[PDB]
Amino acid sequence: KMAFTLADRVTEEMLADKAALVVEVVEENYHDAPIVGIAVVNEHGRFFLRPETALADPQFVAWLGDETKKKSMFDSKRAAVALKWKGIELCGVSFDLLLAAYLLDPAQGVDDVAAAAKMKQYEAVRPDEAVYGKGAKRAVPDEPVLAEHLVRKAAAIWELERPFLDELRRNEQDRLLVELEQPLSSILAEMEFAGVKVDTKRLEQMGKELAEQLGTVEQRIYELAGQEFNINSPKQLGVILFEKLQLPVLKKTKTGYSTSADVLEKLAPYHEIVENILHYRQLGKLQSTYIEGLLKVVRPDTKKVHTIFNQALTQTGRLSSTEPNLQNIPIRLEEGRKIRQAFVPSESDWLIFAADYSQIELRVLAHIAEDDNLMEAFRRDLDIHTKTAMDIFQVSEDEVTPNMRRQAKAVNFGIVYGISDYGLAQNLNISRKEAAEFIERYFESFPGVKRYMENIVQEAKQKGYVTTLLHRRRYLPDITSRNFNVRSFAERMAMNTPIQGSAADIIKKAMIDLNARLKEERLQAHLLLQVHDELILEAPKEEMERLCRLVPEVMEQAVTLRVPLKVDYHYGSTWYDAK
DNA sequence: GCGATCAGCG
DNA sequence: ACGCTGATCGCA
Secondary structure, X not given: OOOOEEOOOOOHHHHOOEEEEEEEOOOOOOOOOOOOEEEEEEOOXXXXXXXXHHHHOHHHHHHHHOOOOEEEEOOHHHXXXXXXXXXXXXXXXXXXXXXXXXXXXXXXXXXXXXXHHHHHXXXXXXXXXXXXXXXXXXXXXXXXXXXXXXXXXXXXXXXXXXXXXXXXXXXOOHHHXXXXXXXXXXXXXXXXXXXXXXXXXXXXXXXXXXXXXXXXXXXXXXXXXXXXXXXXXXXXXXXXXXXXXXXXXXXXXXXXXXXXXXXXHHHHHHOOHHHHHHHHHHHXXXXXXXXXXXXXXXXXXXXXXXXXXXXOOOOOOOOEEEOOOOOOOXXXXXXXXXHHHHEEOOOOOEEEEEEEEOOHHHHHHHHHHOOHHHHHHHHOOXXXXXXXXXXXXXXXXXXXXXXXXXXXXXXXXXXXHOOOHHHHHHHHOOOHHHHHHHHXXXXXHOHHHHHHHHHHHHHHHHHOEEEOOOOOEEEOHHHHOOOHHHHHHHHHHHHHHHHHHHHHHHHHHHHHHHHHXXXXXXXOOEEEEEXXXXXXXXXXXXXXXXXXXXXXXXXXXXXXXOOOOOXXXXXXXXXXXXX
């Protein structure tokens, strides 16, 4: 139905200096995956090219790489990375509709052109799922169905560019797309393509040790339970604890019984089996996710893992990381931290270099809230949990006990997550009366945080949305709900999102400043991972000393706040050893 | 197939 | 409590 040239070869009129480009990769995981079709819409009309044709033609390749040839796309990163696996550079992406849709309203969950198009009541395009199927039965259709689909997506991107950019202009989000999220897309593409080398022998050996520990702990749980069962069934585990062993229920559920982590911590004193079950859960997570799960996504030629950073998913502006998740590798417990010994540099006599912001969230809160007490704590580089304990419990530094520090620590997390008596009470295992007392005492020591948290809830109601430092938005319609619980969640989001979101803005800006500085200095160092408030690089060992000065200077000066930003850095032979 | 329940991550 | 993903369960 839609008019286009199904083209047999590339022609000059397909290489105009402005174009909607669709480079279609149908595999969900785009790493080394086929490109199945290409579509170009421009001043001269609508074209479909076969990829074997278009990607052998040197005039098409030059066009793709010529940064003065401007492209409007959807998920430019998907196309850039599939093109990198083929030795082809994409350049001149001036508009990414996925990133434009995500900045206007992350709540829409826009992950195809069809859904972005619905924001401007453009409906003359099919959803990808309707054309392809989903996950398993996800197939490439015959050429006529495919060609029409790609051309309609490109016609859509061609129409929608001016309206998305007008609304981003009005939102004052125009620079957030053009100077932050689009240049970041390119950097993320480099990091994904680079990958992270994995010592698959270390994994298999750690796996052997875990199967033996896990063998012993399982057998001990069968000895103590007096009967075999599935420890990985929260339902069967409930029967064994609360019916067979008669352990007390301290927290009623709907279905029957809770075996959550919080519940088993409080049950530990009542039976020897409870700590063995928590250990089996520790070991069983490492074995299933970080040994077996990691081995099946390692490329067997290069032994690298290529994550996919989803830049348009989180409600706050954080990235996320899939297949595998490299933003949730163990560190907290020693046995788990040893998994990081399998993450190695990709070249001989390179090292891993890790740099991490120290308490970016509380430093952002200090700036945004303009709280004199919190700004001064940071200007003295005080231990902020100890100072919080000093203020809420009314004691000098040397009179703070570890137990006071641990509880003032929970108040501090409470504050940034959006504080509630019920929340702090659950976390600290105290009454809601006791928690309301800590919060009350926190607010008279931190009167600016108090004023800020009341003003941010009022502003989310007045405006309909809350905002970060670089003008990311989140709509909070539930802030007016007459359901207490629904409204309270929205108050916490109003409190937490500009903190977590502004932290994300700052590390993203640092990633862009870091790459411009590595290029200027023409260092071999490159990014591998971002884990929310930490950057991870590999470089030749001869670069470590330049990096120990450069990486922290750039992360520190990413943005100017009323408090300094502080960075700790480590390097070493393996991810484990950069600590 | 999908929600719920667990673990991992800041 | 705020924000995420993966392996598993057991009911459909």
